[PDB]
Structures are given as C-alpha cells and as structure tokens.
Amino acid sequence: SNAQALNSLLQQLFNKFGAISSSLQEILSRLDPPEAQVQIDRLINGRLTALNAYVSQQLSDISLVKFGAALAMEKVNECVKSQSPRINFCGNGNHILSLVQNAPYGLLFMHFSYKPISFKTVLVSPGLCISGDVGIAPKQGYFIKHNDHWMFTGSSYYYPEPISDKNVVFMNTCSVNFTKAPLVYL
Amino acid sequence: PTNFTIVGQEEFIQTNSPKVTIDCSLFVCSNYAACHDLLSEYGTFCDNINSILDEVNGLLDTTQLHVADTLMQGVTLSSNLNTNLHFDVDNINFKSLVGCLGPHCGSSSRSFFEDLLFDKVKLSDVGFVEAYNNCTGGSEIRDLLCVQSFNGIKVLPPILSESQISGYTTAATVAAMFPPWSAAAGIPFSLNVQYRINGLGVTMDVLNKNQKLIATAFNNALLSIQNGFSATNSALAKIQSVVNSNAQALNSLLQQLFNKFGAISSSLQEILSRLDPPEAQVQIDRLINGRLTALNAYVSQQLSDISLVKFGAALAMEKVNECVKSQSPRINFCGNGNHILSLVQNAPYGLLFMHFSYKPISFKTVLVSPGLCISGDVGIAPKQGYFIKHNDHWMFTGSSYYYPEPISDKNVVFMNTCSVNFTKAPLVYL
Amino acid sequence: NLLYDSNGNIIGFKDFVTNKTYNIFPCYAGRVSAAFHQNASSLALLYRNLKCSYVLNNISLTTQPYFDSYLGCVFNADNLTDYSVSSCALRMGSGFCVDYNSYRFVTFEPFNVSFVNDSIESVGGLYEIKI
Numbered sequence: 001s002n003a004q005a006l007n008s009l010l011q012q013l014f015n016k017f018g019a020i021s022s023s024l025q026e027i028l029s030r031l032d033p034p035e036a037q038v039q040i041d042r043l044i045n046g047r048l049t050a051l052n053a054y055v056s057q058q059l060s061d062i063s064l065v066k067f068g069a070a071l072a073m074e075k076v077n078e079c080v081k082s083q084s085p086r087i088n089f090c091g092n093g094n095h096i097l098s099l100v101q102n103a104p105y106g107l108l109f110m111h112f113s114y115k116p117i118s119f120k121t122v123l124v125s126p127g128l129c130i131s132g133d134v135g136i137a138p139k140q141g142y143f144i145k146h147n148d149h150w151m152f153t154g155s156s157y158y159y160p161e162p163i164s165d166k167n168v169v170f171m172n173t174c175s176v177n178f179t180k181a182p183l184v185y186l
Numbered sequence: 187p188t189n190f191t192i193v194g195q196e197e198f199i200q201t202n203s204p205k206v207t208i209d210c211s212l213f214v215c216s217n218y219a220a221c222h223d224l225l226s227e228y229g230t231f232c233d234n235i236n237s238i239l240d241e242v243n244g245l246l247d248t249t250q251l252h253v254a255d256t257l258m259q260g261v262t263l264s265s266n267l268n269t270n271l272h273f274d275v276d277n278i279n280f281k282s283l284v285g286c287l288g289p290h291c292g293s294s295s296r297s298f299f300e301d302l303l304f305d306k307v308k309l310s311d312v313g314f315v316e317a318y319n320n321c322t323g324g325s326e327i328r329d330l331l332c333v334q335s336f337n338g339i340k341v342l343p344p345i346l347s348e349s350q351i352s353g354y355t356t357a358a359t360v361a362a363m364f365p366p367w368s369a370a371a372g373i374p375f376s377l378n379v380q381y382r383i384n385g386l387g388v389t390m391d392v393l394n395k396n397q398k399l400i401a402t403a404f405n406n407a408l409l410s411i412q413n414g415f416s417a418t419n420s421a422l423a424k425i426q427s428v429v430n431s432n433a434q435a436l437n438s439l440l441q442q443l444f445n446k447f448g449a450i451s452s453s454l455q456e457i458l459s460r461l462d463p464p465e466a467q468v469q470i471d472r473l474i475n476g477r478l479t480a481l482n483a484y485v486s487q488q489l490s491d492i493s494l495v496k497f498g499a500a501l502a503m504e505k506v507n508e509c510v511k512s513q514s515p516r517i518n519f520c521g522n523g524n525h526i527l528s529l530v531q532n533a534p535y536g537l538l539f540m541h542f543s544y545k546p547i548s549f550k551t552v553l554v555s556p557g558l559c560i561s562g563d564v565g566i567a568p569k570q571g572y573f574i575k576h577n578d579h580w581m582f583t584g585s586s587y588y589y590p591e592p593i594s595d596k597n598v599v600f601m602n603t604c605s606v607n608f609t610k611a612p613l614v615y616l
Numbered sequence: 617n618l619l620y621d622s623n624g625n626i627i628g629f630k631d632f633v634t635n636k637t638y639n640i641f642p643c644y645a646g647r648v649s650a651a652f653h654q655n656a657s658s659l660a661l662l663y664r665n666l667k668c669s670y671v672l673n674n675i676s677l678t679t680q681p682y683f684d685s686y687l688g689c690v691f692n693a694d695n696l697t698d699y700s701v702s703s704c705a706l707r708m709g710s711g712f713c714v715d716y717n718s719y720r721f722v723t724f725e726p727f728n729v730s731f732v733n734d735s736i737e738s739v740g741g742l743y744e745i746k747i
C-alpha cells in the first residue's frame with residue numbers, strides 16, 4: 001500500500017491538468033510569460049490538490065496504526081506477562097499462555113491453547129441434597145455415579161475423584177430439583 | 187436492602203454500514219465524447235477514487251465475517267432439538283427470542299423480537315433491493331433512489347444477509363438454555379442466575395425460596411424491553427440516524443450535478459449545442475473540476491466515517507465475548523449497576539444487547555462493624571458483608587440483603603493480629 | 617405547461633395540441649457485474665435488479681444460458697442454490713457465490729454449529745454430557 005501510494009503521488013507530475021504541456025521546462029520559450037503564468041497556475045493548483053489529498057489520507061491512516069499499537073500493548077500486558085480472567089481475548093479457545101516476537105512493522109503473538117481430541121458421554125448432576133437437607137454443588141466440574149457411588153469429575157477431563165470439602169460449595173437449603181442422596185455424609 | 191427486583195436495559199451497537207459505489211465517468215460525464223476526451227487529462231483521480239472505495243468496502247465485509255465468527259465460536263447444539271415445542275425451561279419464557287420456524291429450520295430466522303425491531307425501518311438490504319427492483323416498470327412517482335442509480339451512485343448489499351446473522355444469534359441464544367450449555371460454563375440457566383445474584387452479597391436461602399419470583403421478574407423485564415420500542419427510545423433513534431445520514435449524504439452528492447460552478451449552464455448539452463468547439467472547452471473544465479472536488483470531499487468523509495463503525499464493531503465483539511458468553515470481573519462495563527447477565531440479538535446494521543440488573547426497592551438502617559477481635563487477639567473480617575449484633579449475639583449479614591447468619595469459617599477472613607479499631611468481643615470462639 | 621419537482625427536475629408535460637398529460641422517466645443506464653476465474657475462459661455475467669426479459673429485449677441479445685436470481689439476471693451460470701460452499705472467492709452478495717469446476721451459482725455458509733446426538737431432557741435429575 002505504501003509503494004502504491006508513493007507511485008500514485010509520483011505519477012501526478014506527468015499530468016497536464018488542462019495545460020498545453022505536462023513539463024515545466026517545455027513551456028519557457030514557445031510561450032510568453034504573460035501567457036505562461038496561466039499555464040503554470042493550473043499545474044500548481046493540481047499539484048497542491050494532490051499533496052493535500054495525500055496528506056489527508058496519511059493523517060486518516062495514522063489513527064489505525066495507533067489503535068493497533070494500543071491493542072498490541074494491551075495484549076502484551078494481559079496475555080504475555082500475565083493472564084487476566086478474560087474469555088476469547090488473547091486467542092480463540094481454552095487459552096494457556098502466549099509469547100511475543102518482533103515482526104517487520106509490528107509484532108507477532110503465538111498463543112497456545114488446550115484442545116481435546118476424544119470425548120466420552122456420561123450422566124452428570126448439577127448438585128446434590130444430602131442428609132442435613134444441605135445442598136452441595138461442584139465448583140468446576142460435575143457429579144457422576146461410579147461403582148454405585150457419588151463421585152466428582154472435572155469439566156475438561158474424565159477422572160473420577162472422591163467427594164471432599166475442597167471441590168464443593170455448601171448451601172444451607174438445597175434447590176427443589178437437586179438429586180436426593182441421603183447417604184453422602186460430609 | 188430488604189427487597190429486590192430485576193430490571194432490564196437495552197443498548198444498540200453499530201457494526202456494518204451501507205456500501206456505496208460511484209461510477210466516475212458516468213458521474214462527471216454522460217454519454218459525451220468531448221467530456222471524456224477532456225477528462226483524459228486527469229488520468230489518476232477516478233482510479234484512486236475506485237481503489238479507495240474498494241478498500242473501504244472490503245474492510246466492512248471483513249469485519250462482518252469477524253463478527254459472524256465471534257458469534258459462533260464455541261456453540262454446540264443438540265440434534266434432537268426443535269423450537270416448535272421447546273421454548274421454556276425453569277419458568278423462563280424465551281419463545282420471543284428464538285427462530286427456527288418450519289421443519290427445515292431455515293429461511294426464517296428472525297424471531298418476534300427481531301421482526302418487531304425490523305418493522306420500524308424499511309431501508310435495509312432487502313429494502314434497497316426491493317427499491318432498486320422497482321426502477322424498471324410502473325407509472326408511479328419517480329423515487330430518488332432510481333434517479334441516483336442512473337447517475338452512478340448505487341448501494342450494494344452485503345455479503346451476508348440479515349437472515350444469516352439472525353440464525354447465528356438464535357443459535358447463540360439457544361446454546362445457553364439446553365444441554366450441553368456451552369455458554370455458561372456448563373451449568374443450567376437458573377443456577378447461573380442464582381450464582382450471579384449470590385456473588386453480589388445475597389444469601390442462598392432467599393434465592394432458593396424465591397426462585398419463581400426471580401423468574402417472574404425476569405419475564406416481566408424481558409416483556410418490558412420487548413414492548414418498550416413503541417416510544418421515543420434511543421435505540422430506534424440510533425438505528426434511524428445512520429439511514430438518515432446516508433440518505434442526506436447521497437442527496438447532497440446528487441445535488442452537485444446541477445451547479446454551474448462559474449460556468450454558463452449546469453448541462454453539457456446546452457454548452458455543446460450553442461458554443462463553438464475551441465471556446466466551449468472552458469466551462470466543461472470548470473464543471474469537471476467542481477465535480478471532482480465534490481467526489482474527493484465525499485470520499486474523504488466516507489473514509490473518515492468508516493473507522494468509527496469499525497471501532498464500534500470491535501467494541502461489539504468485545505461485549506459479546508465478555509458479557510454474553512461469560513461474565514468478567516469488570517464494573518460498569520456490560521451495564522450500569524449490579525450486572526447479572528446479557529443477551530444479544532440482531533438489529534439493522536448492528537447488534538442489540540439486553541442487560542439484566544439487580545435493583546433494590548426497600549432499605550433498612552442497621553449498625554455494622556468492619557471487623558472483630560476475638561480471644562486469641564485474633565482478627566476476623568467479613569468476606570462480603572458485615573457483622574451485626576442481633577439478640578445480643580454477633581452474627582453475619584450480607585451487603586445486598588438483610589438476612590442474619592451465624593458466624594462460620596466460610597464467610598470470614600482470619601488475621602494473626604487484629605487492628606486497633608476493631609470491636610473487642612472476647613466471647614466468640616471459632 | 618410543465619411539472620417540476622422540489623429540486624429542479626422534470627416529471628410532467630402537457631401537449632397543447634392534444635390536451636394530454638404525460639410523464640418523464642429516464643431509461644436504463646446501469647452497470648454489469650462480471651465474475652472471472654483465472655482457470656476458465658468465459659465470464660459469469662450479472663445484471664443487478666433487472667429481469668432477464670428486459671435485458672434480452674432492450675439491452676442486448678446473446679446466445680448464452682440465463683436465469684433469474686434474487687439479485688438479478690445471471691448469464692453463463694446454472695441454478696444450483698441448494699449446494700453450500702464454505703470457502704468462496706467470488707462473492708456477489710446476500711449470501712450468494714459463484715464457484716468454478718462451468719460456473720455454478722451457490723450459497724455462502726462459512727460457519728455452522730456442531731451437532732451432537734444427545735438428549736435434552738433430564739431423567740432422574742441427570743443430564744447427558746460429553747467429557
């Protein structure tokens with residue numbers, strides 16, 4: 001784009017703009033100065049208009065690279081040096097981390113993400129209601145049945161674990177549509 | 187607070203913009219050979235204008251594709267899911283926010299909400315198509331769009347129709363209400379609302395006892411947002427503003443073809459039929475200069491205006507990412523006040539967000555303590571709430587709902603040394 | 617004897633020898649859209665917002681296949697709007713595209729939702745989820 005803009009700006013000197021010649025040295029002996037002034041005025045006006053248009057285009061384009069650099073600074077601050085609780089900001093998916101490298105007229109970010117490859121269908125429950133009429137809800141995961149026992153599993157990997165106090169949230173009153181299990185004492 | 191309710195707020199964010207194409211030769215000249223021979227001297231303005239217009243039109247399509255990709259990042263629906271009899275779960279009515287009408291679940295993606303929103307403005311892409319299809323045939327009045335299309339100015343439709351964005355918004359809305367719920371971290375909608383309300387400082391008991399009231403308040407807020415369009419709302423004004431501005435710009439550009447610009451007439455036919463060739467080439471030059479100046483001004487204005495809608499679409503993408511599919515710890519970002527959640531719908535040239543907020547209605551004056559110092563000279567501070575004294579016994583209460591609870595280890599923060607301005611209570615053992 | 621608009625145009629007319637009121641409209645001076653692929657030799661023509669009869673009777677007369685689409689009249693392309701393509705290089709508008717294999721007028725569906733074969737109801741308070 002820069003090369004095309006420079007070429008378009010350079011090609012403006014070869015136009016006539018309504019005059020009898022595109023060059024300035026050509027009309028200096030074949031025409032009198034009182035008659036060459038009008039011919040030079042057209043070229044001057046055309047070249048000034050072209051320069052003004054180029055200046056306006058450049059001033060309009062600078063804001064885009066300014067916003068891009070601001071976004072790059074924010075990305076370096078919130079994706080490289082640290083990880084902020086923002087979804088689909090650094091990359092697209094389960095973001096882990098990112099690295100930064102230098103790129104011609106910019107920067108290059110390399111984001112690493114967690115992608116599953118095999119799935120397994122299971123039956124889950126959003127929460128349980130246990131003996132003291134108390135509700136237990138998984139923090140990040142689900143409650144499943146394994147070997148006729150209520151166990152806990154993660155939301156991104158299938159690995160049955162025993163229910164403990166470090167992976168559940170307690171509530172004094174359980175909801176109306178919670179699974180009743182008056183045998184899980186915790 | 188001792189009593190609360192749920193309110194709703196609407197917001198419109200512009201994403202796209204009408205694509206305008208101008209024919210340089212047909213605008214400056216018209217079926218005249220002398221005009222073309224004289225314009226051949228300025229052999230760079232038309233190509234530059236066409237290139238700038240193409241570069242402008244390409245980025246709008248790119249941004250629309252980016253928004254379409256953002257709306258359906260991780261949407262996963264079920265095959266055994268039809269919208270003809272599945273429209274309410276957990277006392278939440280959302281029939282007016284889903285499409286998928288018919289056996290094929292296609293060709294009709296706009297719901298009742300989107301239909302009511304689109305029935306206000308007629309100059310949409312389908313509107314422009316139906317207007318341009320009426321220029322050839324009929325003895326009615328001559329519309330301005332037809333006289334603009336015959337001079338070079340024409341509005342082209344985007345690469346993606348509104349019926350496709352509607353089908354994407356419908357899927358994004360459905361994906362948050364049926365298993366698998368791949369829009370709320372894998373939890374049901376009612377439990378998600380309950381957790382979002384509890385995260386503000388509200389106890390779980392009042393939420394479990396008043397689930398039907400919360401559902402009724404949510405439905406009432408949705409109905410209010412729905413029927414609050416037949417008024418002077420700012421969303422409809424913002425929607426009509428872009429269309430009015432485009433129409434005014436097109437009219438101002440068309441009116442530039444009837445100005446003398448210092449010549450003897452505004453028509454080349456009157457000049458080429460009354461003046462001799464060697465002298466008639468003076469007024470055509472002034473006309474060409476004026477028309478080229480007008481075209482350059484319009485191109486500059488359009489190029490300056492496009493960046494605004496580009497940044498608006500970027501903000502809309504960020505809002506969709508951080509308010510609809512997930513809730514980020516950011517205050518006053520999605521909406522003003524205690525934000526619960528947000529829904530997204532399509533709108534003429536952009537998106538419409540509906541944010542739901544928690545609003546108290548009645549308050550009670552109480553006495554609170556920022557912390558306590560107990561037997562082992564050990565300090566205890568509330569997690570999210572306050573410490574009150576009820577029936578001559580220190581207990582804990584929330585910061586958004588007055589409900590006393592006994593002090594336990596699940597709502598306190600311990601400190602090996604208490605501050606100097608903590609209430610001395612050497613009778614509380616933990 | 618004449619009727620003008622609110623801008624300075626001419627819409628009316630009255631013949632003083634026959635006492636008849638006429639109207640004035642400008643005829644078609646539009647443009648044509650041409651889609652071209654570097655592997656082919658011919659072109660795919662599109663006359664926007666025009667019926668094929670108006671093109672064949674007033675604009676020109678060709679010996680190429682033609683049909684009517686939602687955007688206009690299409691020349692040198694068959695009607696295969698029931699086939700979707702994810703990646704397209706010839707975008708025409710309103711969710712349509714021109715593919716080459718011979719030009720075909722197809723739809724544009726770049727994004728689709730992943731479908732899963734699981735139930736949506738809760739039996740015994742449990743849901744079916746893939747982990």
Ligand SMILES: *[C@@H]1O[C@H](CO)[C@@H](O[C@@H]2O[C@H](CO)[C@@H](O)[C@H](O)[C@H]2NC(C)=O)[C@H](O)[C@H]1NC(C)=O
Nearest residue numbers: 175176177178274275276277278376397398738
């Ligand atoms: C608890 O589960 C029951 C059973 O699914 C729910 O009752 C259904 O609710 C939906 C939505 O209001 C209705 O369309 C059905 O007709 C109801 N079925 C029956 C048998 O009542 C109930 O709404 C759920 N409650 C909560 C708080 O989630």
Ligand SMILES: *[C@@H]1O[C@H](CO)[C@@H](O[C@@H]2O[C@H](CO)[C@@H](O)[C@H](O)[C@H]2NC(C)=O)[C@H](O)[C@H]1NC(C)=O
Nearest residue numbers: 293682683684685686694695696697698699721
């Ligand atoms: C072009 O192809 C489409 C799709 O094959 C045709 O649309 C079908 O037309 C038949 C006959 O009128 C109907 O029975 C189908 O229901 C239509 N299908 C759809 C998806 O619309 C169309 O008629 C063909 N011709 C033209 C000029 O569009």
Ligand SMILES: *[C@@H]1O[C@H](CO)[C@@H](O)[C@H](O)[C@H]1NC(C)=O
Nearest residue numbers: 188189190191396399547548
């Ligand atoms: C809260 O307000 C609603 C509506 O005014 C009322 O029905 C309800 O009884 C109130 N709750 C309490 C605890 O006062």
Ligand SMILES: *[C@@H]1O[C@H](CO)[C@@H](O)[C@H](O)[C@H]1NC(C)=O
Nearest residue numbers: 313315316317318319320324
């Ligand atoms: C086009 O003309 C027809 C003539 O019957 C009319 O019914 C239709 O409403 C017109 N459409 C527009 C957009 O003016």
Ligand SMILES: *[C@@H]1O[C@H](CO)[C@@H](O)[C@H](O)[C@H]1NC(C)=O
Nearest residue numbers: 630631632633634635636637
């Ligand atoms: C037209 O109308 C005028 C006034 O009514 C009348 O004088 C004239 O004779 C009419 N011309 C014809 C051809 O009928």
Ligand SMILES: *[C@@H]1O[C@H](CO)[C@@H](O)[C@H](O)[C@H]1NC(C)=O
Nearest residue numbers: 652653654655656657716717
């Ligand atoms: C034509 O298509 C073939 C197969 O896709 C490809 O190998 C070849 O380079 C193409 N030719 C041109 C001129 O693009």
Ligand SMILES: *[C@@H]1O[C@H](CO)[C@@H](O)[C@H](O)[C@H]1NC(C)=O
Nearest residue numbers: 643644669670672673674675
């Ligand atoms: C187009 O051609 C048809 C058929 O010859 C004719 O009836 C009609 O008047 C023509 N229209 C124009 C504008 O020439």
Ligand SMILES: *[C@@H]1O[C@H](CO)[C@@H](O)[C@H](O)[C@H]1NC(C)=O
Nearest residue numbers: 700702703725726727728729
């Ligand atoms: C969905 O889109 C992808 C890429 O756009 C494509 O490969 C796939 O075939 C599409 N699936 C359907 C069912 O259209």
Ligand SMILES: *[C@@H]1O[C@H](CO)[C@@H](O)[C@H](O)[C@H]1NC(C)=O
Nearest residue numbers: 121265266731732733734735
């Ligand atoms: C979906 O699953 C059910 C039960 O597991 C099975 O009967 C049916 O054939 C499956 N359908 C497809 C398309 O896999």
